[PDB]
Amino acid sequence: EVQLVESGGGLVQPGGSLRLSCAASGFNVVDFSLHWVRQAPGKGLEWVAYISSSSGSTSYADSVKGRFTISADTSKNTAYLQMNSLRAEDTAVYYCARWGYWPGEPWWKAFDYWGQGTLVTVSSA
Amino acid sequence: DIQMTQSPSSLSASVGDRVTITCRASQSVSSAVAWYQQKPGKAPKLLIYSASSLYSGVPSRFSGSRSGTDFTLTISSLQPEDFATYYCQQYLYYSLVTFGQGTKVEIK
Amino acid sequence: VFKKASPNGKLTVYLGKRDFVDHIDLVDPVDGVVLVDPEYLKERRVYVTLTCAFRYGLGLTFRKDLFVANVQSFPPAPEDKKPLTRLQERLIKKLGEHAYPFTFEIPPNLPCSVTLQPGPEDTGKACGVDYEVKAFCAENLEEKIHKRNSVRLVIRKVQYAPDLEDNWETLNDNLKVIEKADNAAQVKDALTKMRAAALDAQKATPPKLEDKSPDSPEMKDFRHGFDILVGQIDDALKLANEGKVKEAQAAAEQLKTTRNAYIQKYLPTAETTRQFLMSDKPLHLEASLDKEIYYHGEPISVNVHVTNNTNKTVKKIKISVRQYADICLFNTAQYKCPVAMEEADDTVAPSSTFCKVYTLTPFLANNREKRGLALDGKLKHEDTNLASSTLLREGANREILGIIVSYKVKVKLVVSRGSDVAVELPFTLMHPKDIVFEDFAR
């Protein structure tokens, strides 16, 4: 079945780095797009970044534009997110989501299968 | 950036009543609005996509309507699973996704 | 509202409107209240009617009239018919115990209010179709009328025009902005707007294929074309996201090709070809209208594409918008009146290709002096414009309609010396879709 396994969270000092991995089962990444959706504790969801393996095109957010890096891996069905110089505002639980491609129903069904999510926390001590 | 706003930031209703939840677009997004029901401490679930269509699995007491740039959702609330925070997402393009500030349905 | 009293002002008729719109399912009902005095009606009752009158020029008029509508209101309730409306019932707010109303209904397939224009020396006869609500009081229906007991209003019926055109207009403006843009921000905003417009248009249906099934193959091809268009917009948007503005502009230029594909399928076009002796290749001419539904005063741009390989040069282009009017009666005749004429001295070399867009506008003020036109009311009134095109019968009758009005655009090429090749493009002209008292008298 479809399951978006998301793992790689923890506590990191400010200015540190982390690598958030999103593994997928039951479908190949070459057929769908993979996003990242934040959630601050007690606030709404926020868009982070995404990647599409059919064209190599990636676009980030205005809050994490210059720091994060996203890369996929077709042979393993995982898309990697890279954390760099994490700030205090990034102490939020992260979800991995799948979105279809333009021609047909899959594009219309936005984020049909999400992930359980992993929690990352940034504190000085 | 296309902006999503949910006006009734909190609603109070009991089991069996009728609940309406609204959303207002800052730009012309032809449909391209989806509603998510986020349980306390759980990942979002897809209730209504294409701003009017139903997703298989979700119960039938859920429906939406689009008028210009205003989107609304309607429920006939039941006991176990219809008390949580709901969301309103616009998905015109891959790199344009913006979520709406959530609304909570408490118990009187 | 609007009122009008008889020459003996003991009978006053009110109405909520002077113009009624035609919904093809059912025209709006005529709501009014009749104020009388029972003393002058000592033994007599007040009458109301509605007819689709015909006019020309005992006013020396030939008549062919067909409609009847009868509601008498003295007393108002022979039976409690009362299909009441809000304004009709509320009109008794200031009116006493003599004011008994009426209610009427119009068939949903009657001719609209059209009137031909006569003159002292006119190219056409005088004719028209107009409605009238006439009120009077006498012993019975068949009794002779009198002028001191009558109120005869004249109302009008108007059809208003029925999203895809707006979406295409938005796409055109965004494409122009894309072409003229200099930074990535305006490019991205324009691309977002045109993506939204293209999706919204894909959600719609074209006027030509309306009668066909929603799952018919033509609808599938139409949605496929819009799918291709949105894909090209997506490619341009991705390039704009990367920042490379020039490639985004080229990807948007590909939208010109896809629009050209759409135009020849769903827009008015025409092509005629002519050849002569003592030559090798013929002459070809093509024209296209941007849209089908037009609004009164909205300029009409007519694309002209010409290619030629003959041994003759041509320096003349004439574009015209021509009236067409029918009279479905015993005096049957057909009319044609240029409403707007155009002339340019453009070039036709023996071997060259030409394509320019020319804009025209049919307007009554500049075109008034000619006779035999097609109008929808009295010229003196401010709300009087040219006659909107008669929406053709949906398989219904034609003879009873009276006057049919249509428009089409002509492009003429003037052959040089040692017929003139022409095309025609049908199109459509339509109008865009306590109480304070006033007098009805026009």
Side-chain angles (χ1 to χ4, degrees), chain A, chain B, chain C residues 1-79 81-85 87-92 94-141 143 145-381 383-392 394-397 399-442:
Chain A
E1 290 194 37
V2 187
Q3 281 201 359
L4 270 296
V5 152
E6 167 54 36
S7 282
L11 181 131
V12 56
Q13 301 294 125
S17 47
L18 210 35
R19 284 191 51 210
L20 261 53
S21 303
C22 171
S25 59
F27 67 97
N28 290 281
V29 295
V30 290
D31 303 345
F32 316 67
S33 82
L34 297 166
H35 292 227
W36 291 83
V37 175
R38 196 150 45 170
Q39 167 149 309
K43 295 212 153 346
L45 309 118
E46 203 194 299
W47 189 73
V48 175
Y50 85 98
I51 185 173
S52 58
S53 302
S54 58
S55 308
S57 191
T58 70
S59 191
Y60 300 91
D62 294 345
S63 180
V64 309
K65 182 77 75 74
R67 302 176 283 143
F68 296 1
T69 304
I70 186 164
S71 55
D73 189 337
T74 284
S75 72
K76 281 144 64 195
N77 289 320
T78 89
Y80 295 87
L81 191 70
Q82 201 140 347
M83 278 332 166
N84 303 280
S85 77
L86 274 174
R87 216 145 50 221
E89 287 166 306
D90 313 353
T91 169
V93 47
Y94 280 99
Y95 308 150
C96 189
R98 139 203 178 179
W99 189 354
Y101 265 127
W102 150 240
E105 279 183 18
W107 184 84
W108 291 104
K109 302 158 137 180
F111 294 145
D112 56 358
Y113 279 107
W114 294 60
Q116 177 66 84
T118 183
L119 155 68
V120 309
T121 296
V122 163
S123 168
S124 302
Chain B
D1 216 5
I2 280 138
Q3 214 147 12
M4 281 297 108
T5 38
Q6 292 200 303
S7 184
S9 323
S10 171
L11 295 296
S12 315
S14 203
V15 52
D17 309 346
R18 203 154 151 284
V19 201
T20 300
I21 274 187
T22 82
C23 202
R24 250 168 165 80
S26 153
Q27 195 174 315
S28 155
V29 278
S30 43
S31 79
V33 158
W35 300 79
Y36 297 84
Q37 166 216 106
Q38 175 135 264
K39 284 290 196 289
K42 282 284 160 93
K45 274 142 191 163
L46 174 75
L47 299 200
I48 289 289
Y49 71 92
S50 165
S52 64
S53 287
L54 194 32
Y55 192 52
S56 304
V58 152
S60 180
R61 72 265 178 170
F62 288 118
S63 45
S65 79
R66 170 202 171 208
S67 61
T69 59
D70 315 329
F71 303 82
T72 39
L73 190 76
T74 36
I75 321 170
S76 170
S77 87
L78 211 76
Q79 187 261 341
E81 58 194 354
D82 314 279
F83 284 104
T85 307
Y86 292 77
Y87 288 116
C88 166
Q89 176 209 1
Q90 84 78 26
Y91 56 96
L92 192 90
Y93 183 78
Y94 284 110
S95 178
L96 260 68
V97 172
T98 50
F99 284 62
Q101 315 311 8
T103 88
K104 191 178 184 190
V105 195
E106 301 202 348
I107 276 187
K108 336 192 70 185
Chain C
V1 286
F2 328 85
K3 62 190 177 175
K4 174 154 138 113
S6 41
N8 171 347
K10 269 54 152 190
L11 156 53
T12 89
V13 171
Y14 294 67
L15 287 185
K17 292 173 299 232
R18 299 208 195 90
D19 49 349
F20 301 78
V21 305
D22 213 288
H23 304 299
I24 61 169
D25 191 30
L26 180 65
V27 199
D28 181 65
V30 180
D31 45 359
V33 48
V34 166
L35 157 72
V36 277
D37 74 290
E39 191 46 278
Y40 160 79
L41 310 185
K42 234 178 163 182
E43 273 97 337
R44 165 161 321 111
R45 80 199 61 140
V46 47
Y47 179 103
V48 194
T49 188
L50 173 129
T51 68
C52 158
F54 190 97
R55 69 154 291 277
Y56 148 79
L58 210 67
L60 317 169
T61 69
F62 46 76
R63 192 162 307 188
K64 169 42 219 80
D65 171 279
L66 255 182
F67 190 48
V68 168
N70 273 275
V71 170
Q72 290 210 63
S73 59
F74 206 79
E79 67 190 338
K81 203 59 150 282
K82 301 190 291 182
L84 292 156
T85 60
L87 178 69
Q88 168 198 356
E89 174 72 15
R90 287 296 180 194
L91 264 158
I92 330 289
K94 314 152 91 163
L95 299 172
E97 73 197 319
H98 315 331
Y100 326 140
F102 55 69
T103 169
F104 279 47
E105 68 178 39
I106 329 290
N109 61 335
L110 278 189
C112 270
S113 189
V114 192
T115 49
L116 305 312
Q117 179 193 349
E121 289 193 340
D122 40 9
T123 205
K125 206 200 299 299
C127 295
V129 165
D130 74 322
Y131 293 10
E132 153 183 283
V133 182
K134 177 159 57 81
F136 95 84
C137 83
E139 180 67 26
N140 258 345
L141 163 155
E143 310 324 299
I145 198 70
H146 265 68
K147 294 178 62 66
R148 269 167 62 190
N149 164 276
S150 69
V151 162
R152 62 180 295 275
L153 261 48
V154 169
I155 70 175
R156 285 161 63 253
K157 181 208 305 302
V158 277
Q159 259 155 289
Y160 283 95
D163 295 3
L164 173 165
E165 305 272 37
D166 192 41
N167 291 181
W168 266 121
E169 175 67 87
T170 306
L171 271 147
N172 289 317
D173 324 314
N174 304 347
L175 193 51
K176 288 177 197 160
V177 169
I178 272 290
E179 286 189 334
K180 298 156 176 358
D182 293 12
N183 61 68
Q186 327 159 234
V187 165
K188 260 147 68 37
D189 311 327
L191 283 168
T192 295
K193 253 167 273 295
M194 47 208 324
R195 171 130 173 142
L199 272 188
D200 192 6
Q202 177 206 334
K203 258 174 157 51
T205 168
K208 186 174 175 176
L209 316 171
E210 283 192 332
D211 54 344
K212 310 309 297 302
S213 172
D215 304 359
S216 97
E218 309 76 348
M219 282 309 338
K220 291 180 173 178
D221 282 351
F222 181 81
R223 298 193 294 245
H224 182 97
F226 264 96
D227 203 316
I228 301 208
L229 165 61
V230 156
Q232 313 204 60
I233 301 186
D234 219 298
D235 289 345
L237 202 163
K238 156 177 331 181
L239 256 296
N241 257 355
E242 282 216 20
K244 317 166 148 297
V245 296
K246 314 198 183 306
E247 306 54 17
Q249 285 167 333
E253 288 206 87
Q254 271 325 337
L255 312 170
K256 314 214 330 303
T257 280
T258 196
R259 155 186 70 179
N260 285 251
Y262 161 77
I263 286 186
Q264 261 88 342
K265 276 284 263 164
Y266 299 99
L267 288 182
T269 59
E271 290 121 349
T272 78
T273 295
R274 163 171 300 309
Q275 96 288 347
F276 320 119
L277 288 88
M278 187 163 330
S279 69
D280 289 345
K281 289 178 183 177
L283 171 143
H284 188 212
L285 156 72
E286 141 189 295
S288 166
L289 282 176
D290 289 345
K291 47 159 50 195
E292 189 171 25
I293 292 329
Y294 287 91
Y295 300 113
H296 278 75
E298 172 50 53
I300 303 175
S301 37
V302 182
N303 186 340
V304 178
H305 177 218
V306 181
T307 181
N308 167 3
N309 315 68
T310 60
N311 303 56
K312 284 172 131 193
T313 58
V314 163
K315 259 49 172 181
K316 255 203 183 211
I317 301 181
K318 276 219 299 286
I319 310 179
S320 72
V321 182
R322 324 161 61 61
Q323 183 54 230
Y324 281 128
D326 313 71
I327 307 290
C328 298
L329 221 60
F330 29 92
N331 321 107
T332 289
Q334 279 327 287
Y335 286 151
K336 37 163 211 68
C337 310
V339 187
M341 202 160 57
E342 173 47 69
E343 181 139 353
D345 61 356
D346 314 313
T347 70
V348 175
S351 309
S352 284
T353 293
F354 331 118
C355 179
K356 293 166 45 61
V357 179
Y358 305 60
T359 278
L360 264 296
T361 309
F363 190 32
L364 182 54
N366 186 32
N367 174 67
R368 183 163 50 230
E369 71 158 47
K370 51 175 50 54
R371 298 92 167 175
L373 261 165
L375 323 173
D376 71 1
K378 306 306 169 192
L379 186 50
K380 46 177 176 174
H381 301 140
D383 51 344
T384 291
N385 303 336
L386 272 177
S388 305
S389 53
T390 295
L391 271 283
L392 292 97
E394 201 56 47
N397 184 297
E399 183 175 6
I400 69 175
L401 280 170
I403 302 143
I404 310 327
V405 162
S406 72
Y407 293 95
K408 67 180 69 180
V409 154
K410 187 157 191 151
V411 174
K412 200 143 82 111
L413 294 195
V414 179
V415 180
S416 290
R417 291 193 297 274
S419 286
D420 307 340
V421 50
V423 283
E424 282 206 300
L425 315 157
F427 73 97
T428 291
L429 211 63
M430 270 159 322
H431 273 156
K433 194 183 294 184
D434 207 11
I435 183 77
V436 185
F437 289 131
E438 203 161 31
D439 284 28
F440 192 100
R442 293 177 184 256

